[PDB]
Design a protein around this ligand. Structure first.
Ligand SMILES: OC[C@H]1O[C@@H](O)[C@H](O)[C@@H](O)[C@@H]1O
Ligand SMILES: OC[C@H]1O[C@@H](O)[C@H](O)[C@@H](O)[C@@H]1O
Ligand SMILES: [Ca+2]
Ligand SMILES: [Ca+2]
Ligand SMILES: [Cl-]
Ligand code: NA
Length: 614
């Protein structure tokens, strides 16, 4: 595949735009996303709208969100020129500001931080698009009486890092980010604890496995980079004493949403050249690349036969991308032979996930050769039936998403239910986005992004009636209709849907009758009101009944949620024999099987959204 790293970086940022919760701006690039989570924080009297959905679900998990914004800001701090020359600096700042704007709302008071919106079990029990979520979305906080030094520390890092990269274009937003970063760090430092002991729902999804000692160091050093005030470098270095004996610092994992030791020690290594950090960084990167030499033996992470450094089953590419980012950043600083070995490791790992692998395919949705088609993502899939296999293919392309990837034997299945293969997540793309920036710096000369991308897709039929003839005689027609909301461009809740069924009364007028002699009556009914005949075109004796489901919520969120049924009969007086459905507009093409018809127009709040009037 002819790689284009400006296009790739463009698409990675587009993934974060697909993860946006809240009210979306009118110039949003993704026409299949709409307003969602508009009531986030309403149960606690707060505007907590905005921010990112974590993955293919709709929980706003604060700890990996803070991590993701921090790593995204980190890469703009290291490679601002790459972002600029690829045309992606504006997009990168705009996407990071979505996250940091939300952190500013969540940081309601200096020692109070809202850290989750959405309950994991309630959110994950339902499969559908963000815009029509039907369940309650409770908000959860840490504060001084129930703290979270990891969450507060990591969010402080996100704000402090963002404050640096925003200073050139928006100094007063930078200063606001910085001021909150200092407050959140003091919260994390003064009130010690794991956030998942206080937002207990988080234990089941983003448990604080590593504790908070790494985020305290991470938040402090980012504050030092953002202020150059010695007090924060001292605090960072002092916090490192809680890491224990430097000879026992862990090195077999990597930078992740839970463990930022690897990021903090790297940053401190560049600032101090202290052997504690230099050796710990190189232990980790040796283990990941050519092997860590214990003088005696060589210790190395598992590699797949295809060449992927493979940490564990879930998010294997995320982990290799995370390691490649540390390698890239360290190899831009260190002067030793390590710099070459680590740089080659990072390039090779990045080339693997971009297509150079035994599957011969890109693992980035919408990019490269044979990319993943079924990422585990509710809104991009666009189900109206609360079913992962309906529709059989995704309605929307989730451009830029790095999927979980292969197992330790390079095996991989592009299947919406294969979570280990096809999970997508904001933390998955965070370091990866920076690596793409680096790949553009290294190999992207003359690469330009895609103009006016993506093109808006023509929607499928989103609102429509399926209708059938119950029976029809010489004095009546009885219709069965199911009114559908299968919206996806974007999905939308509708509670003011209606339709009109049109008839021609010429044969009635010729027999000496009029619309006054036709009675329209509802039978089996799921909350609809059925009107008597109203004129559409009096000169041609065209009339319609208005069938209204006013106040009934219909939405693409389940087998029963997406449709409502009404059966209705149009009756001439009993014993008359003039009634003729064959010239009736909305009778055309109907059979006795329920079937979509374009001749029963559908309306939402009075606005025509489907079908044709006579
Ligand atoms: O799904 C819960 C979380 O578990 C842990 C994984 O590393 C994350 O990628 C994942 O989002
Ligand atoms: O299980 C790993 C262990 O390996 C030993 O060689 C180290 O001295 C320990 O610090 C470490 O915990
Ligand atoms: Ca931690
Ligand atoms: Ca007729
Ligand atoms: Cl349902
Ligand atoms: Na497909």
């Amino acid at each position: 595949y002819p790689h284009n790293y400006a296009e790739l970086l463009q698409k990675s940022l587009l993934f974060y735009e697909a993860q946006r919760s809240g009210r979306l701006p009118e110039n949003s690039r993704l026409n299949w996303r709409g307003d969602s989570g508009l009531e986030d924080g309403k149960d606690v009297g707060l505007d907590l709208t905005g921010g990112w959905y974590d993955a293919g679900d709709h929980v706003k998990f604060g700890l990996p969100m803070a991590y993701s914004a921090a790593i995204l800001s980190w890469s703009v701090y290291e490679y601002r020129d790459a972002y600029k020359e690829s045309g992606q600096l504006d997009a990168a700042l705009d996407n990071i500001k979505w996250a940091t704007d939300y952190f500013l709302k969540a940081h309601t008071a200096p020692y109070e931080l809202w850290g989750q919106v959405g309950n994991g079990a309630l959110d994950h029990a339902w499969w559908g698009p963000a815009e029509v979520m039907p369940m309650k979305r409770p908000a959860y906080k840490i504060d001084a009486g129930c703290p979270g030094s990891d969450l507060a520390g990591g969010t402080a890092a996100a704000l402090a890092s963002a404050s640096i990269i925003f200073k050139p274009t928006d100094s007063s937003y930078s200063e606001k980010l910085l001021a909150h970063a200092k407050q959140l760090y003091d919260f994390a430092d003064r009130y010690r604890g794991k956030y998942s002991d206080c937002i207990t729902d988080a234990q089941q999804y983003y448990n604080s496995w590593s504790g908070y000692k790494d985020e305290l160091t991470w938040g402090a050093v980012w504050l030092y980079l953002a202020t150059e005030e010695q007090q924060y470098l001292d605090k960072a270095l002092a916090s490192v004493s809680d890491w224990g004996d430097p000879a026992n610092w862990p090195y077999r994992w990597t930078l992740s949403w839970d463990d930022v030791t690897y990021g903090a020690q790297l940053l401190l290594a560049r600032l101090t050249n202290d052997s504690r950090f230099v050796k710990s960084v190189e232990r980790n990167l040796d283990y990941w690349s050519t092997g860590y030499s214990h003088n005696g033996s060589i210790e190395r992470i598992t590699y797949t036969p295809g060449g992927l450094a493979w940490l564990e089953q879930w998010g294997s590419l995320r982990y290799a991308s995370n390691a490649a980012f540390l390698a890239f950043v360290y190899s831009d600083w260190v002067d030793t032979e390590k710099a070459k070995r680590y740089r080659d490791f990072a390039v090779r790992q990045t080339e693997y996930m971009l297509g150079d692998n035994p599957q011969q395919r890109s693992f980035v949705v919408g990019y490269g050769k044979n990319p993943p088609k079924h990422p585990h993502h509710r809104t991009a899939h666009g189900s109206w039936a609360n079913q992962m296999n309906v529709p059989e293919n995704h309605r929307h392309t989730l451009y830029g998403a790095l999927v979980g990837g292969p197992g330790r034997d390079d095996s991989y299945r592009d299947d919406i239910t294969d979570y280990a293969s096809n999970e997508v997540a904001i933390d998955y793309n965070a370091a990866f986005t920076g690596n793409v920036a680096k790949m553009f710096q290294l190999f992207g000369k003359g690469h330009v992004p895609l103009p006016d991308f993506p093109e808006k897709e023509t929607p499928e039929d989103e609102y429509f009636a399926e209708a059938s003839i119950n029976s029809s005689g010489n004095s009546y027609t009885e219709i069965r209709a199911q009114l559908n909301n299968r919206s996806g461009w974007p999905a939308k809740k509708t509670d003011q849907l209606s339709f009109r069924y049109y008839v021609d009364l010429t044969e009635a007028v010729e027999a000496g009758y009029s619309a006054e002699d036709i009675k329209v009556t509802a039978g089996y009914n799921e909350g609809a009101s059925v009107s008597e005949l109203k004129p559409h075109d009096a000169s041609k004796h065209i009339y319609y009944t208005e069938v209204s489901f006013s106040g009934v919520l219909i939405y693409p969120g389940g087998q029963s949620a997406h449709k409502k049924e009404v059966q209705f009969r149009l009756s001439a007086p009993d014993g008359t024999s003039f009634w003729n459905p064959e010239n009736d507009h909305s009778y055309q093409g109907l059979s006795h099987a329920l079937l979509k018809t374009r001749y029963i127009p559908v309306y939402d709040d009075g606005r025509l959204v489907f079908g044709h009037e006579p």
